[PDB]
Each structure stands twice: as C-alpha cells, then as structure tokens.
Paper text:
As a proof-of-principle in the utility of our prioritization scheme, we conducted further studies with a schistosome protein encoding a putative valosin-containing protein/p97 (vcp/p97/cdc48) ortholog (Smp_018240). p97 is an abundant AAA-ATPase that serves a major part in the regulation of protein quality control, including mediating the degradation of ubiquitinated proteins via the endoplasmic reticulum associated degradation (ERAD) pathway. p97 is a pivotal constituent of the UPS that extracts and disassembles its substrates from various cellular compartments. To further our ability to conduct target-based drug discovery, we obtained a structure of S. mansoni p97 using cryo-EM. Cys519 is positioned within a flexible “P- loop” of the Walker A motif (GxxxGKT) in the D2 domain of p97, which appears to be broadly conserved across multicellular eukaryotes, but not certain unicellular organisms such as yeast (S. cerevisiae).
To ascertain whether there were any subtle differences in the conformational changes of schistosome p97 compared to its human ortholog, we determined the structure of the S. mansoni p97 apo-enzyme and its complex bound to ATPγS, a slow-hydrolyzing analog of ATP. Interestingly, Cys519 naturally occupies an inward (in) position in its apo-form, when bound to nucleotide substrate (ATPγS), or active site inhibitors (CB-5083). We hypothesize that this loop is involved in substrate sensing and “breathes” in a naturally flexible state, but the predominant species is found in the in conformation as seen with the apo enzyme or nucleotide-bound state. p97 is likely constitutively bound to ATP or ADP as the natural concentrations of these substrates are high (0.5 to 5 mM) in its cellular context. Indeed, most purified recombinant p97 has been found to be prebound to nucleotide that must be removed by heat or apyrase treatment. However, our enzyme was purified in its apo state, suggesting that the allostery of nucleic acid binding may be different between the human and schistosome enzyme.
Author numbering:
A (entry chain D): 193 to 428, 433 to 546, 554 to 581, 593 to 709, 722 to 758
B (entry chain C): 192 to 427, 434 to 546, 554 to 582, 593 to 709, 722 to 758
The structure:
C-alpha cells in the first residue's frame, strides 16, 4: 500500500546521486529505442554504499515505482537464515521471477551478508551461495531488462569477484547529507508532526552536524517527546483539550539537538565550504596565486588546452601558527564551487590514504587539504611512501588540487617538495591592518557589539597578533560581558543592565594580550622565504 | 549462439603479439598435425592466460577454437563450484570426456583460481577433492588426443602450485594493458555500431587514454554516447532527433576526463616514444649508451666472434632534473627495447622477483630503478638483498639491461657497484647551450610561440639551469599568457588579443627564474667523478 507509493520526494539527503540513478536506470527502462540506437549499454550492476541510516534502502524502490518496473527484494539475513538448499532456491526463484516480469529491479539489501570477503567465510555452503550469486549475475542477458542493485556499508566488505567489469561495475556513494539535505530530511520527517509557528527548521538543519536521516528522525521524536513531557506533566485518559494543543517548539528542537549523539560524527565530510574571502582578508598576492592555481584550470580549461600546458596540482602553505591557512583553502574552494576534504595528521597516524585520494577523485573539482603535514613527513615511513605514490599517480589533467599546511617548513622532507608533487610554496604572513580589521569583524559578527566600539582602533592597536590572538581577545571581552550580566542579575534579584559588549570589556580583555609569534620566528620564516 | 560462433581474431583487440603466439602454438598443430609430428614438436597441453581484468583473454580461446575449426567447451569456475559435492566432479569429468569424444577440442576454464586456489586458502575437503580431480584429469590427457586446456586467472600465483608443473600447465601467456595501437584497435571494435561524427579522431582518444583496458574503453564510448543524448534531448521521441545523433569529439573528451580507469597502477611495458632530439644529450653519453645497449642487441654475432660477454649495469649520477629518465627512455627507443620504470617508493611500499621476471619475459628490456638511494644506502635491508640476489642471478647473455639513477652517488652501498652488478658509472651534467636549446624547443612544441621569440637567445641567457628550471620558465610564460587572455576577455565583455606567447611574457617569466643547482653541488659531483 504505502510501499508502492514511495517516490523521489520521499527520499532526502541524496539529490545528485538520485539524478545519476535516474539517468542511469529510468531512461533506459522507459525509452530503450534511443539508447539501443546510439549504442549505450544499460548498466547491470549498481552498488550503493555509504554510512548506515542514509535512506539508500529506499532508492531502489523509488526508482522502480517511478519507472514503472517490477521490484523484487532480497534481504541478505533472510536468505542466510534458511537451510543449505532453500537459500539457493530463493535466490534462483528471485532471479527467475525478475526475468519473467521484465523490466524489473532486484535489490539485494546487505550484500555483505550474502557475499562477504572470501577469507571471512569458513564453510562451503556460504561459498556455494556466493558462487550461485556470481553465476546468476553472469547469466543476465544484455537484452533482458533486469537491473540488480545492492547496498552495503563499504565496498571492500564484498567479495572482490563481485566487483568485476560485468557484475557490479557502477558504484554510487550515498554519504552524509549537507545542510540542504538535512533540511529536506527534516521536512520529510516532520510531515505528520504539528509544528509551532516559531519553528525554523533551517537553523536546526544547519546546527545538526554529522546527522543522518535516522538521526534526524530520532531528533524529531525526542522533540515531540519533550513537548508531551512538559504539557502532560503540567496538565496531568488525557482530555481532548490537551491533545489538540500540542505543537513542537524551537526550544524542544534545541533541547533534542543538544542531547543528540549522532552516529556519523567521525566520517569525512565532502562539501563546498561557506567561507568567503571577506572572512579572512589575506594578501592580494596570495589571492591571485591561488586563483591562478585553483580557478583558471576549473573555469577556463579551454585556454590551458589552447596553450598546451598542464597546470600544477600542488601547493604548500607555510607561515606562523594561527594565521588561517585552513580558512584560505576553504575560501579558494568556495570561490570555485569545488568540494573540500580536510585530513589532519593525527587522523592518518591512527590503505586509508588510497581511500582519501579515491574520494577526492570522485569529487571531480576538489581541494584536498593535508593539515599538520610535518607530522607525516620528516608508521611515518609507510604513510609518507603511500602519500608520495598516490601523488605521483594523480593525473595532472584531473581537477584534484592538493594543499598542505605546515608551521615548520624546514623539517618537511624534501621528497614532498620535488616537482610534480608539491612544487609551489606560498608564505602566509601575520595579518596586516586591513586583514586584522576583517578578522575582528568576522569574529564579532554573531555577537551584539556596542555602537561606540570601533574595530578600526582595535586593529590599529593590535600588530603582530595572529588570528588566534584576535579570537582570544574577543573571547575575553565576551567572557567579561557574561560575568557582568551574571553579577547584575544577581544584584537585581537581591534587591538588561548589560545588553551588548561595551568598550570597558575590550580594553580589559586587551590588558593580558600576548603576541604568540616572536620577531625571531617571523625572521626565521622570512629567511626561509629568502632561501626560496 | 550464432554470434558466439562467429568471433575471430578480428574481434579481439589490445593483444596482437600474444594472439600471434597462441595462433602459432595452437592453430597450426591442430590444422597440420602431420608436419609437427614428423619434425618432432610436442604440441602444448596447458596454456594459462593471466593478466588484469577486462583485457579480453576470455575471448581468446573462443577465437582460436573458431579459427581452427575445433570443438569448444567452456567451464566456469563459479558455475562448477555452485553445484553440490558430486555434481561438480561429474561436470568436470563430463567436460573432459566430451572434449575427448569430439577432437580436436579446446577446454577453457574461466577463473581457474575459483576451482584451484592456493591450498592455504582452501579449508574444506570437497574443494581439495575438486582440485585433485582436475589434476588427475589433466594428467590423463594422452599425447595423441588433440585436447588443449586453456585457463584464465588474474595472477598465476593464485593458482595451486601443483597445476603449474610440467605436463599440466607449462605454458603461460600474459595479456596486459594495451598500448596506444591496441587502445585504438579496441576503440574501433567497440565503435562499430555507434554513429560517429566527422570530427572524431579516435587516434587522439587512444593516445590520451592512459591506464585503460577494453572494458574501460567500452564504458568511455557508452558515456560519450550518453552525453550526446543528454545534449540533444535536453532541449527536446521524434524520429528526426533519433536519426540526427552522432557522437562528437567533445563528448569523447568529456568522457575521458570523467573516466576512472581500473588499471592506472599496473606497470607498463612498452617501447617509449622519446627520441634523442627531445632530450639533447652529450655525444659522449650517447655513444657510451649505444655501446652498452644497442650493440649487443643489433650485433650479437660480433660479440660471439670476439668471445667477450657484455656487462649490463649502468648507474647514472648527476644533479637533479638533468633528465636521466629521458635518457633511459631514449636509449630504449633507439634499440626498440621495452622499458620498465620502478620508483623507490613503489618498491618500499616478493615483488622484486616479479619485476625481474617481467623484465626477463620482454627479451630486450631496459629495467630502470629511479631514486635508487632510497633502497640502497650505507625494509631497506630486505629489498637491497633481494635486488642484489636477483641481479647476480641474471645471465649476462640475456638482453636485460639495468639502469639506476641516483642524485646522491656517495650514499649508495658499495655492493650495488661491485663488478657484475652495476659496474659502469656515468655522469649526466647540467646541459650545455645546444642541449638547452633542444630542451626549450621540446617543452614549447605543443604551445603556439610568437615569431619574434628566439630560443637561441633564451638558451644563451640560461646557463646552469637544469631541465626542471627550463620547464618552470616555460610554465610561467604560459601562465602569464593565460592571465592576459582572461583579462582581455573580461575587458572585452565589459565593453583573440593574445593568440601566442609573446616575448614580454618570457621576459617577465625570467625575472623570478632561479637556478636550482649551486656551483658547490656541481663541484661535489665533479670531485666524485675525479675519485672515479
């Protein structure tokens, strides 16, 4: 009933992948004439992979319902819970019924349950089931309009034989949703819940980092439970008056979000960052160099082809700590609308390097950032060799730009800086007056500031201060404001006095203002620049 | 049925030497047995075809069977291993019996590793029984019976060692990554039923499709056709639209850009297309390399007459960026000898023996070990001992020349330099005027330079610049050209000004040109030469 009405509007968090799968399945199964005319082979093996709870179990059924095709479902656990022969019989019957009712889609949920890695199987019956699956997969004639889709947590957990060139040759990753995907999921799940007029789902979506569809559903459930808690406890069968006055409020959603333990906080996020140049300032020389390196290839490839010269895909930022190299990488990615992948040294020290580079390849225009590079370059030997091998194997014609940041340029292994891997070095110095002004405005954007506090004088006063120092100054001013508010409220209770951060807060925070970079360190960096 | 029984040597691409070998080896004995029997040639019993997936080794056996007119029986590993305990053995026996009944015949075992994996991988008792039955059947083929058993595996090491003995599987052929000509042949095969436009030059697509196998090229063609469908149908099924479809070159380049080949990491064994002119080179080095490599291959009779076996070990040493790899490629090209390139990081990441065996398979081959200092230096111990053992084990009568390149000649362990291992040390210095002119011309071959630009003056100005420095100068000139062109386009829009790299561009690019090799390093190398 309800299953046969699931469509593209009932799946959220995957809109690019959904368009891919639409082009890849629906059009072949609706107008085969054109595809067979021009000679396009429709796919036969589609493997959807990603973190759990992402809604990839509904994609197959949505495609089947929208394309008008028959749908057959194989649950791995259900097949593997039967006897030695009944599992084989059920797989064969599934494929036969799919062929008899063509066009059709066969969905194998939890393929790793049926066909795990060859070394994870200890008996012969399981190997027989894997071999039966392979034999059935190869037996699908090209003419027969049967598409086999499968879902797994990771593609490495599946038997390597299944990922060959005629069995499962298309792979799609349905990963963690971005902010827009989170908002779509929230709208889908709150369709039957009665929200209050003050509910602004956009802000809940933006603050729900590392949430998947299941996590957001649990968040909505917790918010509704909090609303019931309050109302029913204060109005403790339940009378009809209360049941009609229940509407979730933004306070409930914030309470739920604060106490929510999302299941995907440790997964790499591939998205276009929302950091602009106005939040970092930056020397105009750096902006020009980074645009020439990361934007001209992506926006004007025709001119590079015309002059016949391949751009370099490597940059090394070096400079005092806290000067904002990560923000610069994010900003250059944002300008070109390219994805951003951030990897820290500690994460690498904790195989995987190839996975990161493959993920970068999948996102065609991507800025891959290796923060704290000195910890990897001069366990260290293995990771450094793997990184060198991967960088050498990255085609210069593919738009994957590698940026590494190091605070100790003199200790980095020379092999990293050899031409072809990371040949270009950029020096990020301490911010100048305008850059400090922009940094200060960026930090204070979200806070209520007094109409007399002038950011220009604070910038003029702060010289030799890194971005971290300015952030600390702002934090200290806000802490003083909060203390004053607490004290004023307590005194009023004993008998808003502080509506915004005044000037006294700022010159009291600036009393203990310590520059974190000494002139000796700046001279050391300048000397390293001169030697270059 | 008819389609399968009508595929021949013209429907397989990417393997033209191996097909000739298999043709001589199988088809002639099975067509004119009397001649081979009279002379005393024993036709082979076991042919094992190995290589990366997607190459086309699955169709080779059928092509041989169809062109020779011999009966063909197919055995699928997954299909045999998906049956019950006794049914698998019954099927193998029936296959061999039917092959013997109808002779001559060819038995193809696809995925032999499925039936006969390494004994360690096998755990059960039925699997070992299947392997033993296969061995017994193979040994039961009388020399008179005209049955040839071909098999296919990804890597021969994955097969049970017992099968690779004499009399069971004694012939081994490798169907590796296709070269440019093979890629063009595959593209022609796959584009037979696709309407191509008049601007489609498949040769360029073949040349730029590095790391592709037959399946990858098929997917590339499919993506190009799908892009054509997108472009035409997005505005727009009407008959005129269907008849007005023709894949264009832009679609092919889009597909190539978005393609992720599956064989990007496999070693390539081919004759490089780098000539002496591209590198420049000194007459002394060219003459020495000719004596060392070309003379043994082209004139072995004279070496036999004078009765002195040639040494086959060279160590190039010189400042970085001087073009040692290009020298190795050029010497390989002149003699039409294959080229295998191994980098130190790849080795650091059992495989040494495989590399040397692969070199041995290619009769004239130049085995190049770049960055030798990483391995050999006064993990490391194991690799260096394996390298020394394999080098001592190479007969001086086989044409496998080993060239190693090092930027730090004084760190190499003396064992590598002992006579009989790498005994000819050659010094590649910084290029002179003519070499610099050649380097500059080679770098600017693919870009439109202006008529006023004179490479002779550019070479005169640049002295002490390594090859990398000249390449960087050309890169900077091109980058300035791109910047000027983009700015001119923007100014025109606001309302081809730069169709060539002018001389102001080179003058500006040479402002920051910095020599990468100090005179101290050159003197250090000269001192090492004197001590030698």
């Amino acid at each position: 009933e309800k299953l046969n009405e699931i469509g593209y509007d009932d799946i959220g968090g995957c809109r690019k992948q959904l368009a891919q799968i639409k082009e890849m399945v629906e059009l072949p199964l609706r107008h085969p004439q054109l595809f067979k005319a021009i000679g396009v082979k429709p796919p036969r093996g589609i493997l959807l992979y990603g973190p759990p709870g992402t809604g990839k179990t509904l994609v197959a059924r949505a495609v089947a319902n929208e394309s008008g095709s028959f749908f057959f479902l194989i649950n791995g656990p259900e097949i593997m819970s039967k006897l030695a022969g009944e599992s084989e019989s059920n797989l064969r019957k599934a494929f036969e019924e799919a062929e008899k009712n063509a066009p059709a889609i066969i969905f194998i949920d939890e393929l790793d349950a049926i066909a795990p890695k060859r070394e994870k199987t200890h008996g012969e019956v399981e190997r027989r089931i894997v071999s039966q699956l392979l034999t059935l997969m190869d037996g699908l004639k090209q003419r027969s309009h049967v598409i086999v889709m499968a879902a797994t947590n990771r593609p490495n957990s599946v038997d390597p034989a299944l990922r060959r060139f005629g069995r499962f040759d298309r792979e799609i990753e349905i990963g963690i949703p971005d902010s827009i995907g989170r908002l779509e999921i929230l709208r889908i799940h709150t369709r039957n819940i009665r929200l209050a007029e003050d509910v602004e789902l956009e802000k809940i979506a933006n603050e729900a980092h590392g949430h998947v569809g299941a996590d957001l559903a649990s968040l909505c459930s917790e918010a509704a439970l909090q609303q019931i808690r309050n109302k029913m406890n204060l109005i403790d069968t339940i009378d009809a008056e209360v049941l009609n006055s229940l509407a979730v409020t933004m306070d409930d959603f914030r309470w739920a979000l604060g106490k929510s333990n999302p299941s995907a906080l440790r997964e790499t996020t591939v998205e276009v960052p929302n950091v602009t140049w106005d939040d970092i300032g930056g020397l105009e020389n750096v902006k020009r160099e980074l645009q020439e390196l990361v934007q001209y290839p992506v926006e004007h490839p025709d001119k590079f082809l015309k002059f016949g010269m391949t751009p370099s895909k490597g940059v090394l930022f070096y400079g005092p700590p806290g000067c904002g190299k990560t923000l610069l990488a994010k900003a250059i990615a944002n300008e070109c609308q390219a994805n951003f992948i951030s990897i820290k040294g500690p994460e690498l020290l904790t195989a995987n390097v190839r996975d990161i580079f493959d993920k970068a390849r999948q996102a065609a225009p991507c800025v891959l950032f290796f923060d704290e590079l000195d910890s990897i370059a001069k366990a260290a030997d293995r990771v450094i060799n793997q990184l060198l091998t991967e960088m050498d194997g990255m085609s210069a014609k593919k738009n994957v730009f590698i940026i590494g940041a190091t605070n100790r340029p003199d200790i980095i292994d020379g092999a990293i800086l050899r031409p072809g891997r990371l040949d270009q070095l950029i020096y990020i110095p301490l911010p100048d007056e305008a850059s400090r002004v922009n940094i200060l405005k960026a930090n204070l954007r979200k806070s209520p500031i007094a109409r007399d506090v002038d950011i220009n004088f604070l910038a003029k006063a702060t010289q030799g201060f890194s971005g971290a120092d300015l952030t600390e100054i702002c934090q200290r001013a806000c802490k003083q404001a909060i203390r004053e508010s607490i004290e004023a409220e307590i005194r009023a209770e004993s008998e808003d006095p502080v509506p915004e951060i005044t000037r006294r807060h700022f010159e009291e925070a600036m009393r203990f203002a310590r520059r974190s970079v000494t002139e000796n360190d700046v001279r050391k960096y300048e000397m390293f620049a001169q030697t270059l």
